[model samples]
Target: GHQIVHVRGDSETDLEALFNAVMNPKTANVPQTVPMRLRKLPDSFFKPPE
Candidate 1:
């Protein structure tokens, strides 16, 4: 499957934050951001830091 026509808000800061939060390791020094979309991926695909 593939995205038909994906369009996201013009906010790199938000996107980066979302990616890091979902992929980066769990720690006490995580960066902050104003995310517009979190947990964007499927549960099976998103192995969020534990």
Candidate 2:
């Protein structure tokens, strides 16, 4: 199954910080931002009609 990550932040810098934290948590930290979440896509949504 496929999944998606939705993130909302105050500005581009905030978003960049969030992404950096996710990519390199050991050296990065998430700054102030809105709520973020992960959503799993439904498998049927990607299937072609038969």
Candidate 3:
């Protein structure tokens, strides 16, 4: 499957913070930019024709 997940934020620091928080979901205090967006591609789209 060919898919990509895009995580954006107001700034690079914010994005990094969000990723850090996601890596540690159990953390008591989540980063300010905790919420993020994603993009997904269909598995068959990248397949070769038979």
Question: Among these predicted structures, which one has the highest TM-score?
Answer: 2
Q: Kindly report which residue pairs in candidate 1 clash with one another.
A: none
Tens digit per residue, CA lDDT, model 1, 1-50: 87687666867867777677768758434666755346465665655667
The C-alpha stretches of model 1 lying farther than 4 A from their native spots are 1-10, 25-50
Q: State in Å the error of residue 40, model 3.
A: 25
Better of 2 and 3 by TM-score: 2
Residue 25 displacement in candidate 3 (angstroms): 3.2
Candidate 3, residue 9: how far the Cα is off, in Å: 11
Error of 1 at 14 (Å): 0.6
TM-score of decoy 1: 0.28
Worst 10 residues of 1 by lDDT: 27-36
Residue 44 lDDT, candidate 3, scale 0-100: 61
Assess candidate 2 and give its TM-score to the true structure.
0.35
The residue pairs found clashing in candidate 3 are none
TM-score each candidate: 0.28, 0.35, 0.28
Candidate with the larger lDDT of 1 and 3: 1
